Design a protein around this ligand. Structure first.
Ligand SMILES: CCCCCCCCO[C@@H]1[C@@H](O)[C@H](O)[C@@H](CO)O[C@H]1O
Ligand SMILES: [Zn+2]
Length: 807
C-alpha cells in the first residue's frame, strides 16, 4: 500500500451537522452547529488519519438561509488545517468522492471515506472502506455480517428501498418482509433490474406496480467511478496556526484548539495498558495552567519508552504512588484538590534549574536538551523521562547539587503543593470596601491633573500626554535605556521630568496607584476558588535568578512592604474562622549571611552580642559611643549596610543621601575600615567569579556570570552586582526553603498549616488554641535551621489577619 487516503464528504458532512446540535451558536447569535459538528467529526477520522486527506464539496437553489454561511467557514477551516479541498464545477460531491476513491485505490492506496450517506457502501471493498461520522469501520464483511450482502449488489438492494428523499413510497410487505426484511431475497433472479416475469405479490406485483418510481431511484448509482479528474494524492500542508487560533476564537471554539495539535504528533511509540509500572514518568494535560482551577484533560505515563495512557485521568490518578515528571508539583496540587494524596517526586526541571538557573521553563529546558514541550500527555511523559535520563547523569557527578536536590528541591516540591492547594481565606468584605477607598484616591488625583493643566483630558491615553506638555512646554531626552518608540516613551519618558512640576508628579501617583489597585485589590475577590473559598497563590520553585521562590496570581512579592497601601492590602488576607495567622520573619538574614560568608569578626561580633548593626556600624564610622549615635548617623549606616549587599557604588550612595560624592566615598572607606573582611570578600567573590565563571551560595547553588569579564564598563558593572548579589540572597533563600522543609513535618502534628512565603517571611495558619505553641515551634526550627557564624533571629507574630501579625 502506497499509503492511506482519507476522503471526506465535506458536502454531506456539512449538511448533516447543520441539522444536529441545533442549539450551538456563539453567545452573540452567530450559529455554529454545522461548523462544530464538521470539525468534531473531522478530527475523529483525522485521529486515525491517512497520509493524504481530501475534503470533497459540491462545485444554491433551495438550501437553508444560513447553511452556506457555515459551509464557507467549514472550507476556511479545511484550508487552515492544510487539507486538500476538491470540488469540480458541475459534479456532485458523491461522484467525485466515488471517483477519487477508485483512483487512489487503483494507484495502490488503501482508501477510507468518512461519510454517513450509505450510498458509498457500494464502493466498499478491500482497499476502500467507509468511516461513519458516528464511528465504526463499515467494511465489506460488515456488509455480509450485518446485511448479508456484498458491495457489488448494494446500490441495487438500496434501489428497492428509500433512505430519505430517495423517493420510493410503496413496498407492501409479503409474509411481513416489507421490502427490507426481504431486500436480499430479490437478489436471486433480478426482475426489476433484468429478467423475471411471474412471481409473488408485492415482491413482483409492487416492482412493476411502480413505473417512473424507479427511473429516479437510479440515484443510488449516482456514484459513477469514472469521473475524469487529475488531482494527485499529496500529504497534508502546514496549518495556519496563527489564523486557526484567530478562527476558532472567533467562533468561541478556540477553547478546544488543543485537539488540533494532536495530528502533527511525532510518530507514536509503543504502548501498554493503563496502570504503568511503579517508577514511570507521568505526562498530563490540563484545561488551564493553574492546577487548582484546571481540569485534567489527559494523563499518561512512560517507562522504557513505552507510553501508557489512562482511559479516564481522574480515576487513573489513584493508580500512581506519586507524580514523577515535569511539573510534578502541578499534578499534586490537582490531586490534592481532588482529595488524593499524590506527592511530587523527581522532576527534570529541578535538575535543570540546579545545573543552571537560566533553565526556568519546560518549553526552554526541553528545547535546550534535545526535546520538545508538546501538548500531548504521552509526549510530555516520554520527554519527562529522557530529560531525567540526560540530566540526572550530569548532576550525579556533583555532590553539592545532589545534596540540594535531595534535601531542598525535591521535598520543597511537596511543601509547595500543600501551600498552593491550601490557599488563604480573604476578607472579601474588606477588599470591596478597600476598593471603594482606593477608587476615590485615584479620582482626586485625576481631578487634580485636570484642575492643573486646564483641559480635563484623560490620563493614560498617551496621545494627550504629549499635548498637555505643549500647552506648558518642557521636554528633552531621558537616558540610554528604552529609546524613541511609543513603548520606550511610556517606559522611561516623564520619570526624569517628575522633579520640578506637581502636574508631572501627580501623574505618577495616579498612573501607578491604578496598577497597584488593578493588580492587588480587584483581581483578588475574583480569585476566590468556588470549592475551597480561598485564594491559591502559585509557587514556582525554579524561575528566579537568586533561587528565590517566585509566586503569581497575585505576586505577593511585589505587594508594597511598609507603605500605607501595602499594609492595607495584607489586611485583606485573613485566618480561617477559628484559626489564627502566625507570620515568622528572619531579621536581617542577608547581613547575618554576609557576616558568615565574609567571616568579618566585627560583623560577626555585633550579631553575636545581640546589637543593633546600624547603630554599631554608625559608632565605628563616626567615632562616637553607640548611645551618642544620632538619627542621621544611623541613617547613613543603615543605607550603607543595605548598599554593600549589592555593592551599590559611591555615586549611588552619594545620591541616596544628600551628600557630596566626596563624603560618600569617605563613608564607604570608614565602612570597610570597620569591616575589612567584607571588602576582601567582595574582592575574592569577583575573582573566583571571574576565574570559575560562576559564583555560589553557602550550599553550593551555582549561577553562571560570564559578563564579569566584559569590555563595556556599563556591562561588567551589571554582572558584578549580581555576582555577589547571588551568594548573599541565594544563601538567604536556601535557609528559608530548607527551614520550610524541616518545619512542614511538624505542623501536621500540631494541626497547623503553611500558607505563604514572601521575602524572608513565612505565614502559617494554626488553630487558635495552638497558635502560641505553633509559633514557638516554628521559631525554633527556623532559627536553628543551619549553624552559621552568628545567630539567626526570627521575629514572630500572631493575629487574625496578616497585618495583625504584621511581619
Ligand atoms: C574605631 C572608631 C573609629 C572612629 C571614626 C574613624 C573615622 C576615620 O575615617 C577615615 C577616613 O576618612 C580616611 O580617609 C580612611 C582611609 O585612609 O581612614 C578612615 O579611618
Ligand atoms: Zn457522500
Amino acid at each position: 500500500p502506497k499509503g492511506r487516503v482519507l476522503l471526506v464528504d465535506g458536502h454531506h458532512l456539512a449538511y448533516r451537522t447543520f441539522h444536529a446540535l441545533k442549539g450551538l451558536t456563539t453567545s452573540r447569535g452567530e450559529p455554529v452547529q454545522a461548523v462544530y459538528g464538521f470539525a468534531k467529526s473531522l478530527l475523529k477520522a483525522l485521529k486515525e488519519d491517512g497520509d493524504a486527506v481530501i475534503v470533497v464539496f459540491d462545485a444554491r437553489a433551495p438550501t437553508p438561509e444560513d447553511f452556506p454561511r457555515q459551509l464557507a467557514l467549514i472550507k476556511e477551516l479545511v484550508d487552515l488545517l492544510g487539507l486538500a479541498r476538491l470540488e469540480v464545477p458541475g459534479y456532485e460531491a458523491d461522484d467525485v468522492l466515488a471517483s477519487l476513491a477508485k483512483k487512489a485505490e487503483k494507484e495502490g492506496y488503501e482508501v477510507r471515506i468518512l461519510t454517513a450517506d450509505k450510498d458509498l457502501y457500494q464502493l466498499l471493498s478491500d482497499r476502500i472502506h467507509v468511516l461513519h461520522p458516528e464511528g465504526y469501520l463499515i467494511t465489506p464483511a460488515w456488509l455480509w455480517e450485518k446485511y448479508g450482502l456484498r458491495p457489488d449488489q448494494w446500490a441495487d438492494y438500496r434501489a428497492l428501498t428509500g433512505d430519505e428523499s430517495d423517493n420510493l413510497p410503496g413496498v407492501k410487505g409479503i409474509g411481513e418482509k416489507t421490502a427490507r426484511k426481504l431486500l436480499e431475497e430479490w437478489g436471486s433472479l433480478e426482475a426489476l433490474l433484468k429478467n423475471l416475469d411471474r412471481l409473488k405479490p408485492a415482491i413482483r406485483e409492487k416492482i412493476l406496480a411502480h413505473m417512473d418510481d424507479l427511473k429516479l431511484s437510479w440515484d443510488l448509482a449516482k456514484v459513477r467511478t469514472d469521473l475524469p479528474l487529475e488531482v494527485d494524492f499529496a500529504k497534508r500542508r502546514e496549518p495556519d496556526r496563527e489564523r486557526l487560533r484567530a478562527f476558532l476564537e472567533r467562533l468561541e471554539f478556540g477553547s478546544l484548539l488543543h485537539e488540533f495539535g494532536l495530528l502533527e504528533s511525532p510518530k507514536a511509540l509503543e504502548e501498554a495498558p493503563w496502570p504503568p509500572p511503579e517508577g514511570a514518568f507521568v505526562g498530563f494535560v490540563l484545561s488551564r495552567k493553574e492546577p487548582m482551577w484546571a481540569d485534567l484533560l489527559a494523563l499518561a505515563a512512560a517507562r522504557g519508552g513505552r507510553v501508557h495512557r489512562a482511559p479516564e485521568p481522574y480515576k487513573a490518578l489513584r493508580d500512581l504512588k506519586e507524580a514523577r515528571g515535569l511539573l510534578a508539583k502541578d499534578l499534586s496540587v490537582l490531586a490534592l484538590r481532588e482529595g488524593l494524596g499524590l506527592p511530587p517526586g523527581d522532576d527534570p526541571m529541578l535538575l535543570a534549574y540546579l545545573l543552571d538557573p537560566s533553565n526556568t521553563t519546560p518549553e526552554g529546558v526541553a528545547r535546550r536538551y534535545g526535546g520538545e514541550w508538546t501538548e500531548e500527555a504521552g509526549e510530555r511523559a516520554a520527554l519527562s523521562e529522557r530529560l531525567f535520563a540526560n540530566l540526572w547523569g550530569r548532576l550525579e557527578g556533583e555532590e553539592r547539587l545532589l545534596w540540594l536536590y535531595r534535601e531542598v528541591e525535591r521535598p520543597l516540591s511537596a511543601v509547595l503543593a500543600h501551600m498552593e492547594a491550601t490557599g488563604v481565606r480573604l476578607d472579601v468584605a474588606y477588599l470591596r470596601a478597600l476598593s471603594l477607598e482606593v477608587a476615590e484616591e485615584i479620582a482626586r488625583l485625576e481631578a487634580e491633573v485636570f484642575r492643573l493643566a486646564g483641559h480635563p483630558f484623560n490620563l493614560n491615553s498617551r496621545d494627550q500626554l504629549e499635548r498637555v506638555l505643549f500647552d506648558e512646554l518642557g521636554l528633552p531626552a531621558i537616558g540610554k535605556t528604552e529609546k524613541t518608540g511609543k513603548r520606550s516613551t511610556s517606559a522611561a519618558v516623564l520619570e526624569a521630568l517628575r522633579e520640578a512640576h506637581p502636574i508631572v508628579e501627580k501623574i505618577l501617583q495616579y498612573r501607578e496607584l491604578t496598577k497597584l489597585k488593578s493588580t492587588y485589590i480587584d483581581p483578588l475577590p475574583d480569585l476566590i476558588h468556588p470549592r475551597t473559598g480561598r485564594l491559591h497563590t502559585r509557587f514556582n520553585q525554579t524561575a528566579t535568578a537568586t533561587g528565590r521562590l517566585c509566586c503569581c496570581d497575585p505576586n505577593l512579592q511585589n505587594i508594597p512592604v511598609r507603605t500605607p497601601l501595602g499594609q492595607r492590602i495584607r489586611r485583606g488576607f485573613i485566618a480561617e474562622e477559628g484559626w489564627l495567622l502566625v507570620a515568622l520573619d528572619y531579621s536581617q538574614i542577608e547581613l547575618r549571611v554576609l557576616a558568615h560568608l565574609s567571616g568579618d569578626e566585627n560583623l560577626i561580633r555585633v550579631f553575636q552580642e545581640g546589637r543593633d548593626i546600624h547603630t554599631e556600624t554608625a559608632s565605628w564610622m563616626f567615632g562616637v559611643p553607640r548611645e551618642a549615635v544620632d538619627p542621621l548617623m544611623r541613617r547613613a549606616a543603615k543605607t550603607i549596610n543595605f548598599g554593600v549587599l549589592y555593592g551599590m557604588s559611591a555615586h549611588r550612595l552619594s545620591q541616596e543621601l544628600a551628600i557630596p560624592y566626596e563624603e560618600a566615598q569617605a563613608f564607604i572607606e570608614r565602612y570597610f575600615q570597620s569591616f575589612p573582611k567584607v571588602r576582601a570578600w567582595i574582592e575574592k567573590t569577583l575573582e573566583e567569579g571571574r576565574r570559575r565563571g560562576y559564583v555560589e551560595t553557602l550550599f553550593g547553588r551555582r549561577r553562571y556570570v560570564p559578563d564579569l569579564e566584559a569590555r563595556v564598563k556599563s556591562v561588567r558593572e551589571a554582572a558584578e552586582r549580581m555576582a555577589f548579589n547571588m551568594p548573599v540572597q541565594g544563601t538567604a533563600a536556601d535557609l528559608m526553603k530548607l527551614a520550610m522543609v524541616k518545619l512542614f513535618p511538624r505542623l501536621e502534628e500540631m494541626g497547623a498549616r503553611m500558607l505563604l512565603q514572601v521575602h524572608d517571611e513565612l505565614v502559617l495558619e494554626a488553630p487558635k488554641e495552638r497558635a502560641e505553641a505553633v509559633a514557638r515551634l516554628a521559631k525554633e526550627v527556623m532559627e536553628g535551621v543551619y549553624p552559621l557564624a552568628v545567630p539567626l533571629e526570627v521575629e514572630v507574630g500572631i493575629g487574625e489577619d496578616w497585618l495583625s501579625a504584621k511581619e
